[PDB]
């Protein structure tokens, strides 16, 4: 039904279709790597492939899974869903840009450097699921996700 | 020359042990599990065929009783 | 003609799934047709599956729910299922049994034809050599169709076989250097698929050439035994008598085969593989083998069945026997679809047994056969190398294996991948195939003779 | 994942036995290569 | 009540497998009980599996050996199999048919209950919410049992499941920080297992409160079909009429399902997977779903089926269907028993569907859900890290993988490992869970929210 619904997605959540396509691409890429890494180990990974693996782990652990018996995630409106996906895919894009701009330099950014520098931002991306749709209003949750986006857009600038 | 050979052999040994462990801990067990599953499912096909043939035989016997 | 009154029996002796066993029938005729008046006036139809002395084992098309002994009245029509046919069947939509569901009147018979169809003499069946430019490159370049070939689209649950079939229908035409009538037998297609096919045939303005026989998912499940026979009988009337070139689509031969299984189990026949009747090969042959040209006649029937392979097992009886009977299968692959490659045609397990004589000088081009063979070989080797890469990693691969992997990637990206509304002429498909072969050096293109290498490779 | 995802059949059983023996041959050859590299490496350390 | 003298038929008409097909039976009743005086005076019993016309396919419980056709006398009790039940059943030993084998007198009925019981109208069925503190950490902390939950102990031949079941029986109690009655049915159990359980219940003073049904390894096979139903009927009499809190144990439901397969094969009923009857789900559910608590009645019937997973294969029909029917499963693991961890509860495939409601604020403690979930995640990742180091060795692991392996070791050493007579409170189990969660920095406890972490993590 995905092709039937885009007529409605593009006029209620205009960003959601590209976000969804990128999320699926990311999970497919991590699936493709998984067979290689299992047999070979992470030493062979490219620096963009490390970002793919780590963003996929972020999405699986902290966007896909949803403890259905908790006041924060028994229900998850679509504003919250698309917000979480937008932040995670924006993180992915910024990290891949940071890697592809400094792979040719002496200022080489790596997943380890990003991890160390943004241990906080990654934990926020991990704890986005705990925002409560009713205990915290839609406006509050969207504002907090926008603020996390700002925090990330500042962290990456300060990293580079 | 000795040291260079030593280092390169260290790398080669690490890689080959990783390959051997990969095979004998992932690839071979995967194939063994698939083989067990294949044998079980072929037993299932055979059992279903046996049941169908048994049913046909019973129906032929009942036909004999219906005709005689 | 039949002047004698029809006998009507209230003598039902049994009801058993789709079957209705009568008794005291006067001289039953096998394959006879029967009109069952149920108690409440509902009138159903059925075919005599077997006769024995005074017994008949009717097979009720519209199902047996509501039938009862002692009040159901079976009128024995006295003749095998003769369906009406007329040229104005083109541009109509009929239900599974050939009754109208487009709110137009019944088909004022131009003639009556036996839905089984009178078999054609192999000595005066012509060989189909005119290639159909389907527009889909994964077909034209490598598994080309010829006008008269039985070439099913094997596919699976969830793949876009409907989109592929619609694209072929709206793009097929002879090679340039004769406009297809369509006869479309929907069997067990859900409403979404039936409405997709119908809306596409209207959108392309083709409706004046399309004759739909719908047997939806919710329609009775024995009717889809005769729906494909109705479709091919109308196709034969349009082709071998009206002289039109007809493209027959059959939407789900697996739904047909499962209707066959239902009847076989109801009859308690000795069942073959996976429970399907043993005679499935013959019964599917009587459906598929009604394609092809014939001498004197100018028409032809192209036939493009569609198969849902259960569990994607191409060795399952339906795809297996269809592959025995039909001249090679196009094959729609889940591993490509999940990667989002449309059309998901996998060129390795698909072939067109009449391709070889439908391509070459004067017909498509001199390099067609060689490009097809070489792309197939390079793709196969690329798949083997791709399997190896997972084991040995990209360090252990030779640069030649890397060439093959790049060819595989760009082959799926350029050659197979295609716009649903884009019809690549055979010439464009060949140029796009050469663009890939020129990834390799000439020395590695072993399946192309030196003449056709030198002529085409460097340009 | 657990299974190779070939569909059950006698053909599949034959292919899987062939593949199992292929992987075992690979294991043996690579283990001997590792033993050659290990004997050489040990010799080289001692020297 | 039946005032009419009961008919004794000698008119046997065949004997096949366990089935005596009587004929000339007068108004035979389906599921009636038949008493067979064999030629030599041996009295067997049986149940009418089928009636047709005058026939009666009496399935004999003790088997058919010695049945003479013309001399066996089958008296038709005129009623379905009704078990006498009285509270005096507590503290007794019965054989698989309810006949005493403790040299006590036959049960002086307080009532006669249809052995098959009746379903509880779901609208008046209370949802198990009181937690049973089994004392086992792997249960109370990650699979906590509610009172009324159907929760089998999946195990394999030779494992400690006997010891685990005895431990649950000897330290089960509510988390309110009155005795359980126990009904223990055993099927196909060896004399060693019967002695183990009897000796355990007697060593503890509980034997006043236990009521054993024994069908040892060499007692009749078909009698195992009804032994669970006798046990659950007594459990229902005690729980829903005498208001005891009954814990039922059904030992070797594998040795039951194979009795089911034996009878169903002798009947030639349609087989499911691995030859087991097509309705084994329905039958296993007829057993298991006699559990839970009832509106307005203070009693309850916990169930702890024990079953031997054949070949340790949790996809085997017995464990699979039991998994679909029951409210979880405590999975007992060879890969731990061979390391001599006790109890070898491999939590990762264990499950308890009523933990989610049996834990939380005001019942046990308010961190319980998060602690359990985090222990699951950390255990799973630790197992994955072990499987990874099997390939890449110690050198390639990062400090986080080393952290997870440290957690896995200390988890199987502290949390799972437990004294066979050690009775850990749920609070102690949760605190031991925290000692392990503290192995990690907070941000690696991704399943626990900040409000929980900031309160419990530090101490």
How many other C-beta atoms are found inside a 10 Å radius of the C-beta of residue E118?
9
- Helix-helix angle A78-102:A16-40, to 10 degrees: 60
Cβ(E349)–Cβ(E153) below 8 Å? no
Question: Of E387, C160, C386, B20, nearest to A32 (Cα)?
Answer: C386
User: Quick one: closest CA in C to B57, which residue?
Assistant: C270
**C-alpha angle E241-E246-E247 in degrees, rounded to nearest 5:** 155
Task: Give the resolution in Å.
Answer: 3.9
Contact state of C311 with D11 under an 8 Å Cβ cutoff? no
CA distance E70 to E14: 10
Cβ(C159)–Cβ(C312) below 8 Å? no
**C-alpha angle E75-E80-E85 in degrees, rounded to nearest 5:** 110
For residue C447, give the 3-state DSSP assignment. Answer: coil
Q: What phi and psi, each to the nearest 5 degrees, are found at residue E11?
A: -80, 55
CA distance C136 to C276: 34
Number of cross-chain residue pairs from A and E with Cβ atoms under 8 Å apart: 25
Cβ(C447)–Cβ(C428) below 8 Å? no
Chains B and A touch (3+ CB pairs under 8 A): yes
- How close, in Å, is residue D46 to chain C by CA atoms? 30
For residue E153, give the 3-state DSSP assignment. Answer: strand
Instruction: Provide the phi-psi class of C243: left if phi over 0, else alpha when psi is between -120 and 50, else beta.
Output: left
**For chain E, which domains are there?**
1-459 (3.40.50.12240)
Strand intervals (E) in A4-134: none
Question: Which subunits have 3 or more CB–CB pairs within 8 Å of chain D?
Answer: B, C
- Helix-helix angle A119-127:A78-102, to 10 degrees: 160
CA distance E443 to E437: 11
Q: Which residues pair with E153 in a beta bridge?
A: E306, E330
Task: For chain B, give the residues followed by a break (C–N over 2.5 Å).
Answer: none
Residue partners of C178: CB distance under 8 A and separation at least 6: C245
Mutate to test the interface with C, among A28, A29, A40 (most CBs of C within 10 A): A40
Contact state of E393 with B58 under an 8 Å Cβ cutoff? no
Cβ(E330)–Cβ(E154) below 8 Å? yes
Q: How many residues does the structure list for chain D?
A: 47
C111, E86, E298 from E240: Cα distances, Å: 76, 13, 8
For residue E46, give the 3-state DSSP assignment. Answer: strand
CA distance C250 to C192: 16
Contact state of A40 with B26 under an 8 Å Cβ cutoff? no
DSSP string, E366-423: TTHHHHHHHHHHHHHHHHHHHHHHHHHTGGG--HHHHHHHHHHHHIIIIII---TT--
Contact state of A67 with E446 under an 8 Å Cβ cutoff? no
DSSP string, C199-258: HHHHHTTGGGGEEEEEEETTS-TTHHHHHHHHHHHHHHIIIIIT--EEEEEES-HHHHHH
Q: Is E274 on the interface with B (CB under 8 A)?
A: yes
Q: How far is CA C89 from the centre of its chain?
A: 20
Question: Of C80, C70, C81, C78, nearest to C20 (Cα)?
Answer: C70
Tell me which residues of chain B, numbers 48 to 67, contact chain E at a CB-CB cutoff of 8 Å.
48, 51, 54-55, 58
Kindly list the residues from chain D whose CB atom is less than 8 angstroms away from the CB atom of residue C312. 7
User: Quick one: closest CA in E to B19, which residue?
Assistant: E391
Residue among E369, E443, E446 whose CB faces A119 most closely:
E443
Contact state of D30 with B10 under an 8 Å Cβ cutoff? no
How many other C-beta atoms are found inside a 10 Å radius of the C-beta of residue C269?
13
Contact state of A38 with B18 under an 8 Å Cβ cutoff? no
Characterize E244-262 residue by residue with b for buried, 16 or more Cβ atoms within 10 angstroms of its Cβ, and e for exposed: bbbbbbbbbbbbbbbbbbb
Direct distance between the N- and C-terminal alpha carbons of chain A, in angstroms, rounded to an integer: 42
How many other C-beta atoms are found inside a 10 Å radius of the C-beta of residue D45?
11
DSSP E425: -
Pairing assessment for the beta strands C92-94 and C210-216 based on DSSP bridges: parallel
Question: Of D3, E399, E393, E383, nearest to B19 (Cα)?
Answer: E393
How many other C-beta atoms are found inside a 10 Å radius of the C-beta of residue C333?
23
Contact state of B52 with C275 under an 8 Å Cβ cutoff? yes
Pairing assessment for the beta strands E43-52 and E32-37 based on DSSP bridges: antiparallel
Cβ(A23)–Cβ(A85) below 8 Å? yes
Which residues of E carry a binding-site annotation for ATP? 353
DSSP A55: H
Q: Is C353 annotated as a binding residue?
A: yes
Residue among A41, A61, A123 whose CB faces E392 most closely:
A41
Kindly list the residues from chain A whose CB atom is less than 8 angstroms away from the CB atom of residue E392. 41
Contact state of A44 with C393 under an 8 Å Cβ cutoff? yes
Within chain B, residue ranges assigned H as helices are 2-22, 28-67
A99, A153, C256, E441 from A113: Cα distances, Å: 10, 16, 61, 19
Cβ(A30)–Cβ(A51) below 8 Å? no
Q: What phi and psi, each to the nearest 5 degrees, are found at residue C296?
A: 75, -60
Contact state of C268 with B27 under an 8 Å Cβ cutoff? no
Q: Which residues pair with C60 in a beta bridge?
A: C46
Q: How far is CA E262 from the centre of its chain?
A: 21
Question: Of E254, E237, E243, nearest to E290 (Cα)?
Answer: E237
Within A41-118, residue ranges assigned H as helices are 47-59, 78-102, 111-117
Q: Is E268 on the interface with B (CB under 8 A)?
A: yes
Whether omega before E372 lies within 30 degrees of 0, making that bond cis, reads no
Contact state of E273 with B58 under an 8 Å Cβ cutoff? no
Number of cross-chain residue pairs from A and B with Cβ atoms under 8 Å apart: 8
């Amino acid at each position: 039904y995905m092709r039937a619904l885009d007529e409605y997605y593009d006029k209620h959540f205009t960003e959601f279709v590209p976000l969804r396509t990128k999320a699926k691409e990311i999970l497919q890429e991590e699936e493709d790597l998984a067979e290689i890494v299992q047999l070979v180990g992470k030493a062979s990974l490219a620096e963009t492939d490390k970002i793919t693996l780590e963003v996929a782990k972020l999405i699986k652990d902290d966007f896909l899974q949803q403890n259905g018996y908790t006041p924060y995630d028994r229900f998850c409106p679509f504003y919250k869903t698309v917000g979480m996906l937008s932040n995670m895919i924006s993180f992915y894009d910024m990290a891949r840009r940071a890697v592809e701009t400094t792979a040719q330099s002496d200022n080489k950014i790596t997943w380890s450097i990003i991890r160390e520098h943004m241990g906080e931002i990654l934990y926020k991306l991990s704890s986005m699921k705990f925002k409560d749709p009713v205990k915290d209003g839609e406006a509050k949750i969207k504002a907090d996700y926008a603020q996390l986006l700002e925090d990330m857009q500042n962290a990456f600038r300060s990293l580079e | 020359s000795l040291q260079t050979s030593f280092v390169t052999l260290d790398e080669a040994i690490k890689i080959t042990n990783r390959r051997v462990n990969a095979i004998e801990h992932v690839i071979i067990p995967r194939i063994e599990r698939t083989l067990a599953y294949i044998i079980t499912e072929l037993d299932e096909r055979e059992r279903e065929e046996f049941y169908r043939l048994k049913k046909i035989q019973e129906k032929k016997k009942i036909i004999k009783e219906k005709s005689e | 003609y039949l002047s004698q009154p029809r006998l009507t029996y209230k003598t039902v002796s049994g009801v058993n799934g789709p079957l209705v066993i009568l008794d005291h029938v006067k001289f039953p005729r096998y394959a006879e047709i029967v009109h069952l008046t149920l108690p409440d006036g509902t009138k159903r139809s059925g075919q005599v599956l077997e006769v024995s002395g005074s017994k008949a084992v009717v097979q009720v098309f519209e199902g047996t729910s509501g039938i009862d002994a002692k009040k159901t009245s079976c009128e024995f029509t006295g003749d095998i299922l003769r369906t009406p046919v007329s040229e104005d069947m083109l541009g109509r939509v009929f239900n599974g049994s050939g009754k109208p569901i487009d709110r137009g009147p019944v088909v004022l018979a131009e003639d009556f034809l036996d839905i089984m169809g009178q078999p054609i003499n192999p000595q005066c069946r012509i060989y189909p050599e005119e290639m159909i430019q389907t527009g889909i490159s994964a077909i034209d370049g490598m598994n080309s169709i010829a006008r008269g070939q039985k070439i099913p689209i094997f596919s699976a649950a969830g793949l876009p076989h409907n989109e592929i079939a619609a694209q072929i229908c709206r793009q097929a035409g002879l090679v340039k250097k004769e406009n297809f009538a369509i006869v479309f037998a929907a069997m067990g297609v859900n409403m979404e698929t039936a409405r997709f096919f119908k809306s596409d045939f209207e959108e392309n303005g083709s409706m004046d050439n399309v004759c739909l026989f719908l047997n939806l998912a919710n329609d009775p499940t024995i009717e889809r035994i005769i729906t494909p026979r109705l479709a091919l009988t109308t196709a034969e009337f349009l082709a071998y008598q009206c002289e039109k070139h007809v493209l027959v689509i059959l939407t789900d031969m697996s739904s047909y085969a499962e209707a066959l299984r239902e009847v076989s189990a109801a009859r308690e026949e000795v069942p073959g593989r996976r429970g399907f009747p043993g005679y499935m090969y013959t019964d599917l042959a009587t459906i598929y083998e009604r394609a092809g040209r014939v001498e004197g006649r100018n028409g032809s029937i192209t036939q493009i069945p569609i198969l849902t392979m259960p569990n994607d097992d191409i060795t399952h009886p339906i795809p297996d026997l269809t592959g025995y009977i039909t001249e090679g299968q196009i094959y729609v692959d889940r591993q490509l679809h999940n990667r989002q490659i449309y059309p998901p045609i996998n060129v390795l397990p698909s072939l067109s047994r009449l391709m070889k004589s439908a391509i070459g000088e004067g017909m498509t081009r001199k390099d067609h056969a060689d490009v097809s063979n070489q792309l197939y070989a390079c793709y196969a080797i690329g798949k083997d190398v791709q399997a190896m890469k997972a084991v040995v990693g990209e360090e252990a691969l030779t640069s030649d294996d890397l060439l093959y992997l790049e060819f595989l990637q760009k082959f799926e990206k350029n050659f197979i991948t295609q716009g649903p509304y884009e019809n690549r002429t055979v010439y464009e498909t060949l140029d796009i195939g050469w663009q890939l072969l020129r990834i390799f050096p000439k020395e590695m293109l072993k399946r192309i003779p030196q003449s056709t290498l030198s002529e085409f490779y460097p340009r | 994942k657990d299974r190779i995802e070939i569909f059950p059949s006698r053909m599949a059983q034959t292919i899987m036995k062939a593949r199992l023996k292929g992987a075992q041959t690979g294991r043996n050859l690579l283990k001997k290569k590792s033993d050659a590299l290990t004997l050489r490496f040990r010799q080289i350390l001692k020297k």
